[PDB]
Structure 1
Amino acid sequence: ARITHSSGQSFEQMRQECLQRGTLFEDADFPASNSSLFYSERPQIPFVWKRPGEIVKNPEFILGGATRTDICQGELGDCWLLAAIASLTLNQKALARVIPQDQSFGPGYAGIFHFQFWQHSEWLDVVIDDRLPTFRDRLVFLHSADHNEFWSALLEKAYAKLNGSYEALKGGSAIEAMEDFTGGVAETFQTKEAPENFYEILEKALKRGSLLGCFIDTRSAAESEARTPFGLIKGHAYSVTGIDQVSFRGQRIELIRIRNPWGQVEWNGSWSDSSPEWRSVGPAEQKRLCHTALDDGEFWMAFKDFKAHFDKVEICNLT
């Protein structure tokens, strides 16, 4: 997994230098300054770059696992990246490949973190300092639901460095991030002209750890990010996170679980969090599907309704 830092130095070497000298790592290739935020204009607010220790008393890299509940979009149009990350978290092992072991703020910590991305035919080590964009003592971009947790915020920073700025992450394709996390090639399915066995294709893809996404087509640039009356977002990358079934009126009903990378704002029809359908599903069956009422961005849908409401599904296999 190839060194890409301009020093030519390795993540462990640079880390070890800092520990010996007793300083924190400052990244010479992606500085904590305005050009790493935006290229098209300076920001209108006083951004202050801060290490996680300067943000909370007790920072932690991973806390309670690196999970999809840790992907909450900030003020950046990178729904496509984060949906890819949330999808990546369903495979512990595809995740360990993008996120090298034993990173923390405990012993060994020198202000330096590293992540692995697949670019162009290869696996790059991308090294960062943990100084993050803040405003009013808060992260502005990607944050975990738990404000003591920084792995998602750092991964996004590393990915922003990959693309030269945070602004370059505005608008993209889930496939781009999916490929960058896996080194696979993404297949696009088109929701209303999908094979007869489309459900089985997704079930089996999810089971072997493939990254699944889906989205609603936007007819015009005017329609981007429009909330439909059903509580869905147009032109917005969602993670497909579950494929399952329940008995309803004594029939098997094919369900699909979807996650908004915002971490909130959800479907409001059949099998949504507070819909009537659930009152006639018992507690065992319901605990198995992990159904709860929470505005966490994750909801179930009937696969039939999913196909009708969404327009595209992407599958990216691991290898």
Structure 2
Amino acid sequence: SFEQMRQECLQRGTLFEDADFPASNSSLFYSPQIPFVWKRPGEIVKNPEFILGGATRTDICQGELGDCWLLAAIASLTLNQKALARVIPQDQSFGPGYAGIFHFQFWQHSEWLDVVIDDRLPTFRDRLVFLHSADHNEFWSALLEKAYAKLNGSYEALKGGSAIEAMEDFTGGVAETFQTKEAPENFYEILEKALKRGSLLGCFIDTRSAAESEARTPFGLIKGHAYSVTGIDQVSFRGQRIELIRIRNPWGQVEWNGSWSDSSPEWRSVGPAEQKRLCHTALDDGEFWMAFKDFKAHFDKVEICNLT
């Protein structure tokens, strides 16, 4: 129990050390390093605060693990302060009662799992190397990420993750899933409404075996790799109405190289405005358009995660 471990440590005058997820290299990687040392918040700042001026979007600043798609889920959690209070119990602080131990709750399949941690964090020049607040006295987000890394087995296990999967872990909800090649007749409008509503949308290509995991296709797509759906629209192309979809690769910047890709002749073909209407520019940002018909042929699954 968390309350019991805190009580034990407190009555013994010591700070908690998590034997299940210790302050060592195995908790960070399965291969690696850059000069870091593990420190508790009270040893890097003088008055460490757990939650400072609210738990909000300004407290979520990427560290050396990256601008993960997982960050988008934590961002959306702060917009649901009721859900945030389930993931992050408010019985906790660096004040009287502190004993170097925190806990977080993640929905797993039919249960909220309590995940317990010690507050030792990877550190550089007395400063957090991974997730951190813009307020360097504030530690909830740093600690949330450590707890999620633990559920997942390591910090390294976090890169490449789905924001959808994390949002499921954070709320107890379930994303709806659709098969692109067996999709409803109004699939376009369904996706359009979900986007307008503020839902998280993801798309994937199925692997037929472990062999296919992170396999790149000749069209510049990657199998068993999480992507995000960010736009859907229509254009006039050579006198026809073409449905388009906008996809973001959130882990690296490999892009689609077929029709409607960044440098493709479709973009040159289409009316002068319409290129600006759809806000298109050719950049190696991991983001791109495809024809919605090519989308359905090349991707296998869509996941829609409605935020209430």
Please indicate the TM-score interval, normalised by the length of the shorter structure.
0.5 to 0.7
The 1:187/1:222 distance shift into structure 2, 3 A limit, reads same
Q: Distance in 2 between matches of 1:74 and 1:223?
A: 30
- Once the 2 structures are TM-superposed, how far is the Cα of residue 278 of structure 1 from its aligned partner? 1.0
The worse-fitting range, judged by mean Cα deviation, of 228-237 and 98-107 is 98-107
The worse-fitting range, judged by mean Cα deviation, of 247-256 and 280-289 is 280-289
The 1:236/1:289 distance shift into structure 2, 3 A limit, reads same
Q: Distance in 2 between matches of 1:231 and 1:238?
A: 13
- Once the 2 structures are TM-superposed, how far is the Cα of residue 317 of structure 1 from its aligned partner? 1.4
SS at match of 2:207: coil
- 1:14-61: per-residue Cα shift (whole Å, max 9, x none)? 999999999999999965433422489xx6886655899999999999
The worse-fitting range, judged by mean Cα deviation, of 276-285 and 238-247 is 276-285
Q: Distance in 2 between matches of 1:279 and 1:183?
A: 46
User: How well do the aligned residues superpose, as a CA RMSD in angstroms?
Assistant: 6.3
- Once the 2 structures are TM-superposed, how far is the Cα of residue 297 of structure 1 from its aligned partner? 0.9
- 1:147-188: per-residue Cα shift (whole Å, max 9, x none)? 999999886545214445325547876653231244321221
The worse-fitting range, judged by mean Cα deviation, of 120-129 and 172-181 is 120-129
- Once the 2 structures are TM-superposed, how far is the Cα of residue 287 of structure 1 from its aligned partner? 2.6
Q: Say if 1:126 and 1:158, in contact at 8 Å, map to a contact too.
A: yes
Number of the residue aligned with 1:128? 117
The 1:154/1:97 distance shift into structure 2, 3 A limit, reads same
- Once the 2 structures are TM-superposed, how far is the Cα of residue 266 of structure 1 from its aligned partner? 0.6
- Once the 2 structures are TM-superposed, how far is the Cα of residue 294 of structure 1 from its aligned partner? 1.2
Q: TM-score, length-normalised on structure 1?
A: 0.61
Q: Say if 1:241 and 1:258, in contact at 8 Å, map to a contact too.
A: yes
The counterpart of 1:208, out of the listed 197, 215, 221, is 197
SS at match of 1:94: helix
The worse-fitting range, judged by mean Cα deviation, of 124-133 and 146-155 is 146-155
The 1:279/1:201 distance shift into structure 2, 3 A limit, reads same
The 1:316/1:67 distance shift into structure 2, 3 A limit, reads same
SS at match of 2:69: helix
Q: Distance in 2 between matches of 1:252 and 1:66?
A: 45
- Once the 2 structures are TM-superposed, how far is the Cα of residue 241 of structure 1 from its aligned partner? 1.3
The 1:162/1:318 distance shift into structure 2, 3 A limit, reads same
- 1:256-289: per-residue Cα shift (whole Å, max 9, x none)? 1111112411111111111111113345322332
- 1:101-133: per-residue Cα shift (whole Å, max 9, x none)? 999999999999999865667889989899765
The 1:176/1:262 distance shift into structure 2, 3 A limit, reads closer
Q: Say if 1:36 and 1:165, in contact at 8 Å, map to a contact too.
A: yes
Q: How many residue pairs align between the two structures?
A: 308
Q: Distance in 2 between matches of 1:217 and 1:124?
A: 29
The worse-fitting range, judged by mean Cα deviation, of 254-263 and 87-96 is 87-96
SS at match of 2:61: coil
Q: Distance in 1 between matches of 2:278 and 2:46?
A: 36
More RCO (CA 8 Å, sep 6+): 1
The counterpart of 2:84, out of the listed 95, 108, 113, is 95
Q: Say if 2:160 and 2:226, in contact at 8 Å, map to a contact too.
A: no
Q: Say if 1:264 and 1:296, in contact at 8 Å, map to a contact too.
A: yes
Number of the residue aligned with 1:30? 21
Q: Say if 2:160 and 2:225, in contact at 8 Å, map to a contact too.
A: no
The 1:251/1:119 distance shift into structure 2, 3 A limit, reads same
Q: TM-score, length-normalised on structure 2?
A: 0.63
SS at match of 1:75: coil
The 1:305/1:118 distance shift into structure 2, 3 A limit, reads same
Q: Distance in 1 between matches of 2:111 and 2:129?
A: 31
Unaligned runs of 5+ in 1: 1-9
Unaligned runs of 5+ in 2: none
Q: Say if 1:88 and 1:211, in contact at 8 Å, map to a contact too.
A: no
Q: Say if 2:73 and 2:167, in contact at 8 Å, map to a contact too.
A: yes
Q: Say if 1:87 and 1:212, in contact at 8 Å, map to a contact too.
A: no
Q: Distance in 2 between matches of 1:122 and 1:256?
A: 36
